Design a protein around this ligand. Sequence first.
Ligand SMILES: [Mg+2]
Lengths: 196, 196, 196, 196
Amino acid sequence: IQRYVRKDGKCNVHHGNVRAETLVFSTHAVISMRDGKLCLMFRVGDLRNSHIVEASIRAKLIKSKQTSEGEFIPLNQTDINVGYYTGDDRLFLVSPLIISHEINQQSPFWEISKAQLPKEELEIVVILEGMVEATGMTCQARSSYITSEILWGYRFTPVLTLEDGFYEVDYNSFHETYETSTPSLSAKELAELANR
Amino acid sequence: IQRYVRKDGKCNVHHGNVRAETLVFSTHAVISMRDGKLCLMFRVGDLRNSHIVEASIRAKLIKSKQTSEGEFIPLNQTDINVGYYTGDDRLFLVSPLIISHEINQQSPFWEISKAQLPKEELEIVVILEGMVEATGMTCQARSSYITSEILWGYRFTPVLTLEDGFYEVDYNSFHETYETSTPSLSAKELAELANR
Amino acid sequence: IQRYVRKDGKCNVHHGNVRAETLVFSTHAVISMRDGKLCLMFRVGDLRNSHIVEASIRAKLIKSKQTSEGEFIPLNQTDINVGYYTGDDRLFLVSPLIISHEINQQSPFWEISKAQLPKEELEIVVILEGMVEATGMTCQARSSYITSEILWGYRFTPVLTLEDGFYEVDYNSFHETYETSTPSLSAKELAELANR
Amino acid sequence: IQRYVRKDGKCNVHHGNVRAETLVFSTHAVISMRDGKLCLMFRVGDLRNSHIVEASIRAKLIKSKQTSEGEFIPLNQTDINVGYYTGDDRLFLVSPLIISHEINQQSPFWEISKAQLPKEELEIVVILEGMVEATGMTCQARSSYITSEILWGYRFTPVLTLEDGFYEVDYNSFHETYETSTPSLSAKELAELANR
Ligand SMILES: [Mg+2]
């Protein structure tokens, strides 16, 4: 069993690193099943040459909406759950990670089906926050996924491989994704169907 | 669909910006229905020329009170819920936002009706907190809404408009508000009535 | 109605202030009823000449204990609830505040009666944390309450008075406390008795 | 009763201290019963010559996994509960502490028995985070526990002793541990058995 982190806290990624370069999110987001739940996921890269202390991830849904009373909100913001409750948004960013927002009753994608997706006018804003160990200062990295950028029924290619006592990152695959069998019903719909 | 945030994280607000100027809250707060719940809301502006990382919002109710045991607390503080539980107080401040505190059983405005409002001796203190990307340092901006400053049965004028691939802010409307049909019962009261 | 905080965010405490001096906790802690719940409370002062951004309060119970399996923990730590869940530990420190830990089933003082108190070998450690606006840096102030320092059946004298459009703090009363009718049963006990 | 923390906030540990040296986690982790619940625990040392403000602890489980849909995640991360919900991960690090993750239904060790442990391919990554009072800057200390490093059915030797009005730390015992009667069933198993 090859350790990921050594006893003295130095990680075993990127042989011969030194722990500006900007951080990178995947260009696309994918939606597909993980242990019977539908999930929207996007990938978030590390910083090749520095740790990010107190790193956290959050996402906003930006979407215009009209309240049952006729109030119209341009570009309304609401928070997408990417680990907030269990502390799984407190990232340990030492190699690219797939962040997953599980689509449940409280998720805004609850009723969005495959067909219905390309119709919706929305944008996921993703936001990484954390203190760069090296620099001492607080960073923020952002990115965005509009409708046409969320690929339904795909999964992220793995990029992490163990080679000679270090784990190397094939950054070429970073944005690459592949197709997999995935129902085209909405989450709400899978739930109804399952629950009888 | 015109993006709000570009792939590399630069937002599309305030054409030709550069991301001291002080931040601004609305002068008044409004109370009115959103999807069948009564809501107290106030607006909170952005910083025209800088992002605010790890920006959060909180509000205190300052109100003198007497405990059933006769203890009298001058200017007692209690926390107003403006997204604390779901992470909707973790703001993405890139254009003025209406913050909403939904008036539920645990809200102190639960039993405050329209008539009853101008009678109560209270003050909402609003507090924005966050690190100014530019400056590196932690900012705090505060403001206040006393009774006469909460307008019952109004809504905030929208200020956000898309113009030629950027979203511009009509800062003139920032404080402006308009009237709308709104019941004059208290939340507790609407709840009773609805629940039979 | 004299405002506590002005529209531009400047508070109306300590006429002619300028917003080292150390922060101060009360020398004693008191235990007494507030709206039918028993409460341990201690007072925590402000900084006469500076705000404290992102100010929070927490408390630890330090008490030696033996697990049902015979493991003996010297000076075991467990967290005392002083607003953690509702965000009432996120302080707005602009005049001395009484912090209250309500003694409920999950509080370690649940079964501690008046008689039983002076028998217990314990220490409350109180810890204020926050960034000094002036200094830019993170402060921590601590203090402690051992058994003999928790006064049962008392209340904190008020210190806050409005004088000519500013609220002045009578710092003399800061530590002073007074007696009030308070049952000498433990919380667990009041609960049983009440619940029949 | 010898105080642990004095009225003015100075702690009574390490006679003649001055409040680089690196922080230290125990080399091993132990698993054993505390008040009828099974617990994985590891020890985390203080900094002999400085306090750590806003100190927090978190742990990740790193373990490769395959989703019921065949997706294979190398070195999957999931958060281990070490006080997140009650605020017991907000440490008061003034002498080495045993951090305890109670193994319940939501813990990944739920179904891991004594026999089954040495078979599993996993790694606990532990991460201390906090601002060094002295230095002004944010620190991160990390360490790791692979399978062979978690000792089943052991307890941490105590290291804290009161000597002449100060509490001294026998740093020799810091990593030392001892054996105790402990069932070899998994938590899930003890639960079933107990619950009839
Ligand atoms: Mg911070």
